[PDB]
Amino acid sequence: GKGAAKYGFKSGVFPTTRSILKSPTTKQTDIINKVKSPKPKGVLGIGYAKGV
Amino acid sequence: MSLVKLANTCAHLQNCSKVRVALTSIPYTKLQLQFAYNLYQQGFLSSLQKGSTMGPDKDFVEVTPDNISTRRLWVGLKYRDNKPVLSSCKLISKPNSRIHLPMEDMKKLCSGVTIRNIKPLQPGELILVRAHNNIMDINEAISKKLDGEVLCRVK
Amino acid sequence: NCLKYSTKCSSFHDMDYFITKFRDDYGITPNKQNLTTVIQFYSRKEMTKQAWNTFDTMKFLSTKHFPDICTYNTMLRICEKERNFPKALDLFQEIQDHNIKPTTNTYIMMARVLASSSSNAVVSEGKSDSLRLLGWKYLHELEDKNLYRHKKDDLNLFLAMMALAAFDGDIELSRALYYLFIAKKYKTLCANWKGNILVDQDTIWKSTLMPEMLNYLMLAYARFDPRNLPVLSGYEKGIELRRKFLREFDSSMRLKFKLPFLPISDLNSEAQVLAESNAIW
Amino acid sequence: ARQNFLGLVVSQGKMQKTVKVRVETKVFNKKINKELFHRRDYLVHDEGEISREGDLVRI
Amino acid sequence: LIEAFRKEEARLLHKHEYLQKRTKELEKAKELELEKLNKEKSSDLTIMTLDKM
Numbered sequence: 001g002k003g004a005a006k007y008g009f010k011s012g013v014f015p016t017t018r019s020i021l022k023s024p025t026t027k028q029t030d031i032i033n034k035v036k037s038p039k040p041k042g043v044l045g046i047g048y049a050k051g052v
Numbered sequence: 053m054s055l056v057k058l059a060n061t062c063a064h065l066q067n068c069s070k071v072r073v074a075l076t077s078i079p080y081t082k083l084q085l086q087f088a089y090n091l092y093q094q095g096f097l098s099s100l101q102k103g104s105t106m107g108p109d110k111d112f113v114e115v116t117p118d119n120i121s122t123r124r125l126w127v128g129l130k131y132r133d134n135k136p137v138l139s140s141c142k143l144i145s146k147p148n149s150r151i152h153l154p155m156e157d158m159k160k161l162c163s164g165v166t167i168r169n170i171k172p173l174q175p176g177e178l179i180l181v182r183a184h185n186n187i188m189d190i191n192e193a194i195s196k197k198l199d200g201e202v203l204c205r206v207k
Numbered sequence: 208n209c210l211k212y213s214t215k216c217s218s219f220h221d222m223d224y225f226i227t228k229f230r231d232d233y234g235i236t237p238n239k240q241n242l243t244t245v246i247q248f249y250s251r252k253e254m255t256k257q258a259w260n261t262f263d264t265m266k267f268l269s270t271k272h273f274p275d276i277c278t279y280n281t282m283l284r285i286c287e288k289e290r291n292f293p294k295a296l297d298l299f300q301e302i303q304d305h306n307i308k309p310t311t312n313t314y315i316m317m318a319r320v321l322a323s324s325s326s327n328a329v330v331s332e333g334k335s336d337s338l339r340l341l342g343w344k345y346l347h348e349l350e351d352k353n354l355y356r357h358k359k360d361d362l363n364l365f366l367a368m369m370a371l372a373a374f375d376g377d378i379e380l381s382r383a384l385y386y387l388f389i390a391k392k393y394k395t396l397c398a399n400w401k402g403n404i405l406v407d408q409d410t411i412w413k414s415t416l417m418p419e420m421l422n423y424l425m426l427a428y429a430r431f432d433p434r435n436l437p438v439l440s441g442y443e444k445g446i447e448l449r450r451k452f453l454r455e456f457d458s459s460m461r462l463k464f465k466l467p468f469l470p471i472s473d474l475n476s477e478a479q480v481l482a483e484s485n486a487i488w
Numbered sequence: 489a490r491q492n493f494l495g496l497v498v499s500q501g502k503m504q505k506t507v508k509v510r511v512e513t514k515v516f517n518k519k520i521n522k523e524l525f526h527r528r529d530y531l532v533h534d535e536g537e538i539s540r541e542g543d544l545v546r547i
Numbered sequence: 548l549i550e551a552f553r554k555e556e557a558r559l560l561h562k563h564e565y566l567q568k569r570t571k572e573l574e575k576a577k578e579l580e581l582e583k584l585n586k587e588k589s590s591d592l593t594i595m596t597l598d599k600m
Binding site: 254261 | 593
């Protein structure tokens with residue numbers, strides 16, 4: 001009963017709604033640009049360095 | 053930015069209020085100067101002055117590394133209706149436990165809701181917050197939509 | 208002197224130019240007097256926040272730069288413009304705390320601040336009558352001791368009194384003070400006029416009729432309420448002061464130049480108030 | 489993205505192509521009511537064996 | 548199925564546009580406070596103040 005306060009006081013659960021499109025579409029320019037953008041270099045980034 | 057020094061300053065101001073001295077001196081640093089200015093704007097302090105360890109500056113003195121060790125900020129305390137205007141000065145975010153609140157939690161704290169065991173803001177009280185190395189009152193930090201470290205209580 | 212004239216003409220560009228010129232080319236930064244003149248500049252431009260910041264710096268920089276009674280009187284004037292009486296009382300208490308000796312201007316400024324604050328319930332925080340009484344008390348405190356007088360202060364004093372009379376709706380006191388001021392001013396100017404009295408009537412009368420005094424008298428008329436009891440009546444000192452002013456007004460009327468005040472000590476009805484407002488206007 | 493942790497090398501040369509990296513993370517403990525650092529050591533691949541003890545790296 | 552796919556794609560693009568509008572409006576809101584502040588600091592007597600210190 002307590003935890004329901006987080007979820008709008010609704011008791012019970014619905015199954016998680018499924019996404020019709022599992023992967024992003026090619027018309028989403030922003031997602032492609034973020035994907036294609038140069039990866040941040042170094043440790044605050046996400047990728048292996050040039051020499052390593 | 054030493055919270056230890058802010059705690060020491062708070063205790064010093066409380067002790068000065070107890071013995072009812074009209075003037076007192078605190079360390080001359082950016083954090084202490086901003087904190088004293090915020091107290092003065094609210095009317096808790098009578099006057100701010102820059103001076104040496106011996107007293108206020110008779111003539112304007114530029115601050116340099118040569119004399120930084122001997123610089124002090126002299127604050128004039130207020131005692132009205134046989135009561136100290138600045139009675140109690142305490143810390144919320146302590147060195148052992150530092151409390152950084154997002155803006156919505158800061159509003160909740162101002163709105164009578166206890167957040168992270170901090171007593172809610174009282175009517176005639178002032179809570180100071182640090183955001184981006186700037187000291188302000190909680191109301192301003194909420195109006196600026198700035199998440200910040202909740203430092204001290206002055207009632 | 209440069210900043211003084213620049214304030215008198217209220218030219219921001221001249222103030223800025225003179226300050227920048229002195230700093231850059233002569234190595235002179237404003238002292239206590241120049242900073243006070245800058246505060247008066249900010250007051251003239253209705254720039255209260257900048258004036259308060261300059262006052263804070265005056266305290267901050269050094270003891271030589273620390274404000275004295277003149278700067279505190281300027282801040283009291285700023286509070287009067289703001290109608291901010293808690294700050295006025297706080298500044299008076301600070302003046303006492305820092306051992307600065309008040310002056311006549313200080314008491315007159317405090318009385319005027321309280322009179323202005325007592326205009327409405329909203330600005331006075333519902334304490335209008337008490338604020339007017341406190342202003343009268345400040346005037347009495349001035350009466351007690353000589354302090355340092357200034358040639359203009361006397362004029363200011365009377366304005367303060369009329370303010371306390373005007374915001375109280377004290378039509379009897381307002382009428383008496385207005386008649387006293389107009390009579391004394393015309394008598395003094397006629398006594399000390401090089402030109403012949405008859406020819407220069409226009410100039411003398413123009414100088415006599417101060418617009419602010421008329422404005423205060425009309426304000427006293429506008430705040431008329433028959434059930435109102437003057438705040439100054441409660442005190443024994445206040446009632447004696449009222450008796451003195453009213454007696455002098457009556458005696459002067461009984462005793463050239465004439466004003467259209469009705470031959471009655473006080474107005475007890477609305478029609479007479481309208482008649483006197485039209486007559487004086 | 490692939491999980492990324494900033495760390496300090498605390499052991500190297502003990503094993504072939506493997507190092508120990510000291511990862512600190514921010515956690516909130518309710519019983520204390522405090523944000524404190526929680527520490528762990530990960531066994532990490534070092535191909536080329538470039539990293540040395542005391543170096544500051546990712547894993 | 549065709550209708551569902553096409554409407555889903557249009558819905559995603561519409562959310563992207565909505566977020567663009569939101570962010571742009573916030574940036575012009577920052578421009579607004581830029582306009583407001585210069586009014587206050589157009590009153591520069593170029594003396595040094597304590598709040599500026």
